[PDB]
Amino acid sequence: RQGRQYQAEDLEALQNELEARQEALSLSVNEGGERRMEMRQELEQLKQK
Amino acid sequence: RQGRQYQAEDLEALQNELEARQEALSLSVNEGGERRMEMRQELEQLKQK
Amino acid sequence: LRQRHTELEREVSRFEDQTQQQRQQYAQAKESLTTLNRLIPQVTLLLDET
Amino acid sequence: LRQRHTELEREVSRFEDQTQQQRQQYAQAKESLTTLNRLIPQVTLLLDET
């Protein structure tokens, strides 16, 4: 499902790798939405103007 | 470390509640950010006025 | 408008306090949940209190 | 300002997409981690491939 055999024989390290990925999730989203959210307000402002 | 003796006999409910509280993390942080930046834009408008 | 600015600064302070408190607290909750789901994600069931 | 609206819509589309994808893939990887540490949180040691 992720990786194709991908060292399943002893996969411990990959979990820690995923933790980094997990972290990059929040960042990658927390920024993203905010940005669009930012422009949303600006967009509204622009519309009002 | 969390709790002092905290239903270690059957703790799954607590993991579920903490997942809910992480959803709350996301909701609250996004709401606070959007509200504060919108009112910062209102501050800017008031400044120009 | 200066009174509005003062109240707006008060509101900025309130939002920042709320955001801090919630983000810290729920981050420590995140750490605790990670410890549970790592060390004992039903490893207690493997133990089963047998 | 309407041209600014057009550019803003472009940016909104780009960020919306990027966030959708990134969150999907990262959530799937997160679910993969959960499946690991749920089905096999070193439960392979109890399996032990005996």
Question: At residue B28, what are phi and psi to the nearest 5 degrees?
Answer: -65, -45
Query: Which residues of chain B are within 8 Å of residue A30 when distances are taken between CB atoms?
Result: 29-30
Residue A5 in contact with partner chain D when CB distance is under 8 A:
no
Q: Name the one residue in this structure whose structure tokens are 């549970």.
A: C36
Helix (H) or strand (E) holding B10: none
C39 three-state secondary structure: helix
Query: Which residues of chain C are within 8 Å of residue B46 when distances are taken between CB atoms?
Result: 1, 4-5, 8
Cβ separation B29–A34 shorter than 8 A = no
Residue of B nearest to C37 (CA): B15
Rounded CA gap, D47 and C43, in Å? 13
User: C touches which chains (3+ CB pairs under 8 A)?
Assistant: B, D
CA C20-C13-B25 angle, 5° bins = 25
Method for structure elucidation: cryo-EM
Cβ neighbours, 10 Å, residue B46: 14
Q: Give the tokens for residue D48.
A: 């032990």
Residue D37, C-beta contacts closer than 8 angstroms, at least 6 positions apart = A15, C37, C38, C41
- Smallest CA-to-CA distance from B25 within D45, C32, C12 is with C32
Distances (CA, A) of D10 to A28, A47, D3, D18, D29: 19, 16, 11, 12, 29
